[PDB]
């Protein structure tokens, strides 16, 4: 399962602001091997950039531009890590 022992961060997974990058981490060295599914849905677009890490922690970051919450479905081996669905209320940038 893994989703039963995942520990994640989220400086920009609980709230973001257009023109500002947002990211999170899925620390789970315990679950060891076991990829993880992560995707977002909503009327907008963003630049995603992930990087595997022998630490099992999935480091990913993106910069959105159109305000609005983003349904982030985070599931391990297709399960549901603590609070899988994490919406992020996005706010305008500086314009």
């Amino acid at each position: 399962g893994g989703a039963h022992k995942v520990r994640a961060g989220g400086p920009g997974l609980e709230r973001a602001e257009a023109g500002v990058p947002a990211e999170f981490s899925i620390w789970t060295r315990e679950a060891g091997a076991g990829g993880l599914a992560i995707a977002v849905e909503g009327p907008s677009k963003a630049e995603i950039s992930f990087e595997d890490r022998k630490d099992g922690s999935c480091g990913v970051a993106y910069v959105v531009q159109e305000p609005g919450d983003y349904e982030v479905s985070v599931k391990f081996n297709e399960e549901h890590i603590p609070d899988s669905p994490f919406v992020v209320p996005v706010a305008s940038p500086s314009g």
Partner: peptide
Amino acid sequence: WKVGFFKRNRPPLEEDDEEGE
């Protein structure tokens, strides 16, 4: 509209099996 990316967790170095020998 709909996009994401798949990951692949994995350990760093290998490990000596049990001292079966």
